[PDB]
Amino acid sequence: RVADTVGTGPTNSEAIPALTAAETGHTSQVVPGDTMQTRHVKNYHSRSESTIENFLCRSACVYFTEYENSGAKRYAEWVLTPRQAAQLRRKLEFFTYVRFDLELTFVITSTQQPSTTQNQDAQILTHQIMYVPPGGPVPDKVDSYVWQTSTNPSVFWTEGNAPPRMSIPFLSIGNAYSNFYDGWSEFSRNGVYGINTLNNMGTLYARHVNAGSTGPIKSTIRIYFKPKHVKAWIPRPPRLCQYEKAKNVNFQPSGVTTTRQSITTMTN
Amino acid sequence: RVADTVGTGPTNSEAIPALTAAETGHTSQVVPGDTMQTRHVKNYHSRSESTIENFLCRSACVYFTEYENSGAKRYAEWVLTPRQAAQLRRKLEFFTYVRFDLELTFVITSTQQPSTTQNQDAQILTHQIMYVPPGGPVPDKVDSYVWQTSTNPSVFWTEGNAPPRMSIPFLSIGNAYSNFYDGWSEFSRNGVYGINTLNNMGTLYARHVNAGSTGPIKSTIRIYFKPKHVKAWIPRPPRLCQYEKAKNVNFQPSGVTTTRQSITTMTN
Amino acid sequence: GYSDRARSITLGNSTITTQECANVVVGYGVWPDYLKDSEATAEDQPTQPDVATCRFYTLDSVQWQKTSPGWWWKLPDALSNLGLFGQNMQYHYLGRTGYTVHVQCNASKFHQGCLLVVCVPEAEMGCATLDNTPSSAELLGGDSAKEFADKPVASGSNKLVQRVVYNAGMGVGVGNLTIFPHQWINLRTNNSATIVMPYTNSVPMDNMFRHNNVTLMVIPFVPLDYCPGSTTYVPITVTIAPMCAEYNGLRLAGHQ
Amino acid sequence: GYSDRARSITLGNSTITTQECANVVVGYGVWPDYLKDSEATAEDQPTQPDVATCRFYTLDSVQWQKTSPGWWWKLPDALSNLGLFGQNMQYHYLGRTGYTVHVQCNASKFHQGCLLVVCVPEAEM
Amino acid sequence: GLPTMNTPGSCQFLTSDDFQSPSAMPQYDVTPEMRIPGEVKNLMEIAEVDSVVPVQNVGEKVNSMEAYQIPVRSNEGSGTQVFGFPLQPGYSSVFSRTLLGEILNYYTHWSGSIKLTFMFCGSAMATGKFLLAYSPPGAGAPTKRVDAMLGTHVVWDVGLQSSCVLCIPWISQTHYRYVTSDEYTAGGFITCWYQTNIVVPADAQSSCYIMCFVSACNDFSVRLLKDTPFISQQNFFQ
Amino acid sequence: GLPTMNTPGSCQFLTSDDFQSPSAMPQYDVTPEMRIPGEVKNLMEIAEVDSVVPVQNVGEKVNSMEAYQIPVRSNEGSGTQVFGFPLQPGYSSVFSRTLLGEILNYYTHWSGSIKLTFMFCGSAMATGKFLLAYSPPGAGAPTKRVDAMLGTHVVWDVGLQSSCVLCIPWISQTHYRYVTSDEYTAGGFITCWYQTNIVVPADAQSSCYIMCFVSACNDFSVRLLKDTPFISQQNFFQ
Amino acid sequence: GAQVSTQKTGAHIHYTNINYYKDAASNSANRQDFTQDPGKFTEPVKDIMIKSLPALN
Amino acid sequence: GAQVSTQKTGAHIHYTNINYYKDAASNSANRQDFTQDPGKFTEPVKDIMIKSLPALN
Ligand SMILES: CCCCCCCCCCCCCCCC(=O)O
Ligand SMILES: CCCCCCCCCCCCCCCC(=O)O
């Protein structure tokens, strides 16, 4: 609940609430009843939508990719990294360090491709999604043994029902996920610079378990993140500039803001 | 429970319950046992269907619109406004101010369009519906970045199961939704006149996430409102005339009622 | 002893006396009061002019003829140019007030007629051209009354109000206007009509120039009649008293 | 702690701040108040506009030159056309008020001069 | 996995259902409530208020204020009729457009007593006497004052108080009636007759008007919510 | 088998929902927490911090540090204007890119009072007086000091403490305003005028600069989370 | 924290309800609120009018 | 072991919740944690600054 205004009256004193000194790096805690006469107002507004948990706990698409039931591109791979979509990236970069659980949701949708093959009568498609932590083997092909998922987490989904969804705990060797890193991987102060140094999150693969039809089909998978139980530290200023790559903070210089006509104009 | 009639007998007195004066703007509270002899009746009828919550809490179609999986019209947009359907509009306009929660239900149905394309074997269609509050970006195209819904509420629905349904809280900067507004937007007493001045409700967009087939398909979405927890003030007379537009109270003059043959005729 | 016909109302430096009147109608059961602290929004301290603004302002008279469709007045606009009430509402940004409307019409025992007096909250009116919305010069005429019509207004490419009377400009049935606070002036019984309307709105305060909260409608359901030899000029007078008027947001003078 | 040079005055929706000022002069020892009942004469009820009339009105500035004899202002007339104070004094017959006059002139440490500010009651000329 | 079983009626959209749904805007601060005059908690608080009845809905009279006037003048005879209409509060054109009628249309069944108030709007020198009557069904409508005198009637004496009330009681075989036209639930007939005459002096108008107001009593009730056959549209409004 | 019934809204993906899901990594030991300075628990702890306002966003000045400077020099006159802009904390270019503005864009409604701090950055020999003003809507913007003096104003005397505060209070008809441009919820105008003059001695600069900082008071609040219209992308970044 | 209430039954049995969501805007409609007060509209006059009394005296 | 808490309702009702999984990382988001402390950022100085006092004395 926000503070309630206190009613004040006329004053003639040596107190100076308005006069301050901003060189001390301190924000003035002046209320409106210090520079004018006010009335008593009973405020009932709540700050319940400005909480970091409410500001960040909403699903967002961070990536989508395609694969086919025939031909060359038979499976899809994606090193996990949220810095490909602009919206969630810009929301998180408000802080230097964060710490949250994750809620993953996948929207898998198929489409029939144009072709001249006849007598097509497709059976329901089943998809497999597999997570490989850094260090494990990778699926060089579509029908390789790695898809046995003896230890690797994986989800089997048949087209036509509720989208698959899982919960991931805070996976980090450190005490918090670093949104920014000012340093290198090597002690020789050369090599990889920036936050790509701390991006050791694993890889996600996706395939069709059966081909379904005799004609071509392309399946697209969209990945959705949703932070839970969020903690955050050291707020930073917003990006302002437009992002360029997913591994670094590079930008093109942009003006402070948009302009107007004069210093006295009340119009954009 | 309605009141119970009291049994009365013959009277000869200077009391005058029948004689009153209607110029005082007061309705006479005369019961039938004031102008005749009655018997004692134990009434058990209830006024449980005349309540505003029961009168207004029923789903109604307020709009429907179409989009396609190919071609030009690839997505659908609709500024939220209930004054397009006559039935719910006329029910609400019984009062000057209302205040309610909302229950949204969507009936999305697809149809195959006539065409000469062959070997059509469609996969299940998934739809996305997205709400943009006033101020946010808009989807200029179908595959634009705005569909990432980082903060904007949205619903993913696969054809074949229960219709999507959500709950919306009373969203208003004021203390009640104004069904009528007698004024302008500008202090210059010119510009937009009427209730269009207070219509700052956002926009709803709808699209196909996948194309499904190689042939054409048109999907229609029907929107249903259902007020809950209703409060209402200052009852008004019913419309009588037929509505013309969605933004104003314009009408064509109509007779008070329908006619009969004479002042003594007992037939329509 | 005393009678129910006689009644005096004192406000400011104004006293209204009547010797043949019906009971007073008090709004929706509510008496106009001031805005409380648990219901306010604007933080600064408001100014209450009291006697200077809460008094009886009389308007021009209109003539009741044998063929008069009726009249209406946008209450806030009607007094926007009278005394210190208009000045306070011209120098401030937000305002709040209730009203006390007294309508007077006197005639003899050989005259007949019946007038409906109704305070309609948020009487949004319609245009004769479905394409546009009506002008401010058509809707609100200050320092004067606005007349209804007996026939429908023609369409075209203008911004005229649909002043047909049996539709009340609001596109309803006129006989239902008795759902709002109302009073009948019957020449054989009544003489005047008093209505004490409180502040109705969906916000705690409002700008008083671009929004009209209520509207006074006077319609003669039963026409005026008499026999040759009696008085032919019969006027109708309207007196409005603001009640518990307060103002917030002092600024420069003007309305733009 | 605080100093005697700094002083803020709040009236209505107006606040005056000063960082180099002398002590305030309060009339003849009396602070402006309202008319009491044992001292009134007019029988009807008066109207007190309060915040709308009791606030700081600034006037035009005058230039202090090396050869300026001086200036004067008839206090009641000066504000007869400003805000709601002028309107209330234009629609009424009798009025009663005290005043708070703040005169400001700033210059550097390399300027010199001295101005006398005096509130003269009933200065018949 | 708790073993369950789905019953007929799953994944169906019944428009009059009552469930719980996930909120689209979670943890949203709703604007506080303020006190607004005239809060409505039931539709029978509206139907219990008077409203003027258009009895003279004959010809072009519906396009004026003449529909609400009931003409009554000096008659060189006695016992003639003033007006008549049936007790059909939601179907007859006399009643289907009033506040009571309008609210009744949204429902299928109604019950309770009815109030008809009459206001005399002549001069203070006119005097009269009228005989308001209600006749339950079973015979026709009464065609003279000797047939209307036998029902539920009031004799209205005109003077000072210029307003009389005729209460139509509930005389039915069922608990409820139908809002639509149905012979099995016929209501009866309401008529008005001259008791003596309207008498005036010289230099006064021998033609006056009456006005009618209809409302409902405390026992009034409605059931079966339905759509009103008045409003209609061809395409979505814009 | 416990007999159940599915309701409308099953197998749907509402992005703002709150349920429980099976964990992919069961019985996983999470790294212990450590104490990090500067923990944030609300977005209004950030908006309540000052940030410099680019008032001189005119022409090429946006591509330098001149956007943040407000030029004030010695004037051979009096009562002229220094600057002016509208009270639109999230839509006007003066305010849309500051910490307050940035946070406001992610929401639809705002409420509360505003702080504008001004720092004078001349020499210790310069003296001045200024008249900061806020005018609620209803008229235009004030065009002279005789029209700005009538609103909520402060007279800033320049000396020693080189920083004054103008608090813009909440003067609205609604509880909340809109972050986007809407006439129904217009805010007002903020202007600054010369009270007397900037006076300097010889061998000192007669041209100085002022700086502005904006922040929110204790009563500030936001509602309706939405997407910001600033960030955008054409293809997935790499 | 189940809420047991009474069902709508004829004249001349209970049901159970549980709230599953933390937003009060998700609950079921308030169907049983049979409270009426027609006095704001039917009789809004300043002076009381006894039924068996001359309205004008 | 059900947990009954209060719902988010307007100003001027309860809900029930049960945990089904043994991993605390599967629970619902912590929406109602309205705790703010802006003193780390707005006023981080070593010496206290009284509002109605000259910042530099
Ligand atoms: C069967 C699929 C299981 C998928 C398991 C995914 C586990 C890895 C989750 C990666 C989360 C990355 C969070 C980065 C946060 C940051 O640094 O900003
Ligand atoms: C994913 C879709 C979410 C949709 C969210 C819709 C939120 C806006 C609801 C608009 C309600 C408008 C009520 C108008 C009432 C009135 O003024 O009569």
From Swiss-Prot, chains A, B:
Provide the transmembrane region boundaries: none
From the Swiss-Prot or TrEMBL record, state where the protein is found: Virion; Host cytoplasm
Job of this protein: Forms an icosahedral capsid of pseudo T=3 symmetry with capsid proteins VP2 and VP3. The capsid is 300 Angstroms in diameter, composed of 60 copies of each capsid protein and enclosing the viral positive strand RNA genome. Capsid protein VP1 mainly forms the vertices of the capsid. Capsid protein VP1 interacts with host CD55 and CXADR to provide virion attachment to target host cells. This attachment induces virion internalization. Tyrosine kinases are probably involved in the entry process. After binding to its receptor, the capsid undergoes conformational changes.
Subunit structure and binding partners: Interacts with capsid protein VP0, and capsid protein VP3 to form heterotrimeric protomers. Five protomers subsequently associate to form pentamers which serve as building blocks for the capsid. Interacts with capsid protein VP2, capsid protein VP3 and capsid protein VP4 following cleavage of capsid protein VP0. Interacts with host CD55. Interacts with host CXADR.
This one is known as Capsid protein VP1
Please give the first and last residues shown and the length of the full protein: 583 to 850 of 2185
UniProtKB/Swiss-Prot annotation, chains E, F:
Which region of the full protein is contained in this chain?
333 to 570 of 2185
Q: What does this protein do?
A: Forms an icosahedral capsid of pseudo T=3 symmetry with capsid proteins VP2 and VP3. The capsid is 300 Angstroms in diameter, composed of 60 copies of each capsid protein and enclosing the viral positive strand RNA genome.
Query: Superkingdom of the source?
Result: Viruses
Q: How does it assemble?
A: Interacts with capsid protein VP0 and capsid protein VP1 to form heterotrimeric protomers. Five protomers subsequently associate to form pentamers which serve as building blocks for the capsid. Interacts with capsid protein VP4 in the mature capsid. Interacts with protein 2C; this interaction may be important for virion morphogenesis.
Name by which UniProt lists this protein? Capsid protein VP3
Localization, per the record, is: Virion; Host cytoplasm
